[PDB]
Symmetry: none
Subunit: 25 residues, 6 copies
């Protein structure tokens, strides 16, 4: 029911960024 996030940590231009999806759990 609640909206959660599942993502990956990626290195972009030397900085750590996050790309993920919103999931229902």
């Amino acid at each position: 029911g609640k909206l959660k996030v599942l993502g990956d940590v990626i290195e972009v231009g030397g900085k750590l960024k996050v790309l993920g999806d919103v999931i229902e759990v």
Copy 2:
């Protein structure tokens, strides 16, 4: 062996934001 993200969706100033933890999977 890789860095993943597990988080929660939160409402901040009318916008949907994410607060999460970096985990090793």
Copy 3:
């Protein structure tokens, strides 16, 4: 000390995605 995530929920092609930054807290 710990790696946390601060991000935004964005609507991309009708799906809810997350873009965020890894931060040290």
Copy 4:
């Protein structure tokens, strides 16, 4: 832990309608 609505404004037969999903935040 509240029910929210995330939606788009669409023009249907000259009237403005909202098409959205109920989410738990």
Copy 5:
């Protein structure tokens, strides 16, 4: 002057949706 939304929550394919009206208040 402002655009507001009023609608009913409907169950479509097991998901809760809204097909609401946009009204000027």
Copy 6:
């Protein structure tokens, strides 16, 4: 793009929606 982030509220046993139109 015109969007809405409104609230779902229980009004006499039925779920209703109230919100504001925002530009995103």
